[PDB]
From a paper:
Ub can be ubiquitinated at any of eight primary amines (on the N-terminal amino group of M1 or the side chains of K6, K11, K27, K29, K33, K48, and K63), and all eight Ub linkage types co-exist in cells (Peng et al., 2003). Affimers are 12-kDa non-antibody scaffolds based on the cystatin fold (Tiede et al., 2014, Tiede et al., 2017), in which randomization of surface loops enables the generation of large (1010) libraries, against which epitopes can be screened and binders can be selected. To understand the observed linkage specificities, we determined crystal structures of the K6 and K33 affimers bound to their cognate diUb at 2.5 Å and 2.8 Å resolution, respectively. Both complexes show a conceptually similar interaction between affimers and diUb: each affimer molecule binds one Ub molecule and the affimer dimerizes to bind the two Ub moieties of a diUb in a linkage-specific manner. The variable loops are responsible for dimerization as well as Ub recognition, and specific dimerization provides two binding sites for Ub I44 patches with a defined distance and relative orientation, leading to specific, high-affinity recognition.
In the K6 affimer, the first variable loop extends the existing β strands, whereas the second variable loop extends into an α-helical turn that bridges to the second affimer molecule and engages in a strand swap of the last β strand. This leads to a symmetric dimer, similar to what has been found for naturally occurring cystatins (Janowski et al., 2001). L74, I105, M107, and M110 in the variable loops create a hydrophobic surface that interacts with the I44 patch of Ub (L8, I44, and V70), and four salt bridges further strengthen this interaction. The dimeric states of affimers in solution and in the crystal structures were further confirmed by size-exclusion chromatography with multi-angle light scattering (SEC-MALS). This showed that the K6 affimer alone is in a concentration-dependent monomer-dimer equilibrium, which is shifted fully toward the dimer by addition of diUb. The strand swap observed in the K6 affimer crystal structure is likely responsible for the relatively stable dimer in the absence of diUb. We found that the K6 affimer bound tightly to K6 diUb, whereas no binding could be detected to K33 diUb. We found that the K6 affimer bound the cognate K6 diUb with very high affinity (Kd ∼20 pM) and has negligible affinity for the other diUb linkages (Kd > 40 μM). Interestingly, whereas the affimer-bound K6 diUb does not resemble previous K6 crystal structures (Hospenthal et al., 2013, Virdee et al., 2010), the affimer-bound K33 diUb superimposes well with reported K33 diUb crystal structures (Kristariyanto et al., 2015, Michel et al., 2015).
Numbering used by the authors:
A (entry chain C), C (entry chain A): 33 to 121
B (entry chain J): 1 to 73
D (entry chain K): 1 to 75
């Protein structure tokens, strides 16, 4: 289950084609944004993708949101702590 | 019903359960096979960590489902 | 290697003492701010902590910034993908 | 030098190395003791993933340092 931006965009197209019985053709990834959230001992990531696809042989632009649950997991033994700032208030 | 539990080193253990079974009971079965105490056990299904109170059926776990096991050292 | 806010504040105080040859005495943690992000195949978390310590036997409030590297790790076999939104533009 | 490699199951491996050694060389040592191929090996020190080309002294890895090992599985 890869996390590369192009694979995520293709997942979006394949999932969209299946849900709405359409047949768009993936062309390119234009831009991507990622925001992450920590839930308990797991990590979640949201991907915001701008992509190129062909609807009727006509190239169009689409925006997709992909939610990845357990994109990461907490392992306490490997974490490394570093102090950046220490000041009185 | 039979379900699969997979370790981070790729080893797979087979379990016998029923949908009514709680997560605490599944951890107990894992403890008997692998000698790991349930308190030190972490179970992941569908991108979520399973809570002790709920049952297998609550998470919509079915035959041939695979769960992921993580240890607390 | 705990990620609990109280343990993190003690780390900040203990590290500050070693770094600046001082000896503040940790009392308690008041509040914390946390945000996480994915770096390569790892996750990092940044902590902003407000705590109480004793300078001369007098309690004071301090603000600390703690950077935790590899607070999480990417494990591909466990991630779960879901498409949330697909729209033209 | 003697360093420690720890698996996610809590197993600890003892190794013999010295600072001139590369990460690729450490992975080779791990394979000889534990039979795991280097491509499937991930090594963690000080919260970062170690690159094969560089040496232990580059990462300031020292006597009794502990490395963390994570496996890459196709499954």
């Amino acid at each position: 289950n890869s996390l590369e931006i192009e694979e995520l965009a293709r997942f979006a197209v394949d999932e969209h084609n299946k849900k709405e019985n359409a047949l768009l053709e993936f062309v390119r990834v234009v831009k991507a944004k990622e925001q992450s959230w920590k839930d308990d001992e797991l990590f979640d990531t949201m991907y915001y993708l701008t992509l190129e696809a062909k609807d009727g042989g006509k190239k169009k632009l689409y925006e997709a949101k992909v939610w990845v649950k357990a994109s990461g997991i907490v392992m306490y033994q490997m974490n490394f702590k570093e102090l950046q700032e220490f000041k009185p208030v | 019903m039979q379900i699969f539990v997979k370790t981070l080193t790729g080893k797979t253990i087979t379990l016998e359960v029923e949908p009514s079974d709680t997560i605490e009971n599944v951890k107990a079965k894992i403890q008997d096979k692998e000698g790991i105490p349930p308190d030190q056990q972490r179970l992941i299904f569908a991108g979520k960590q399973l809570e002790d109170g709920r049952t297998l059926s609550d998470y919509n776990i079915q035959k041939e489902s695979t769960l992921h096991l993580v240890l607390r050292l």
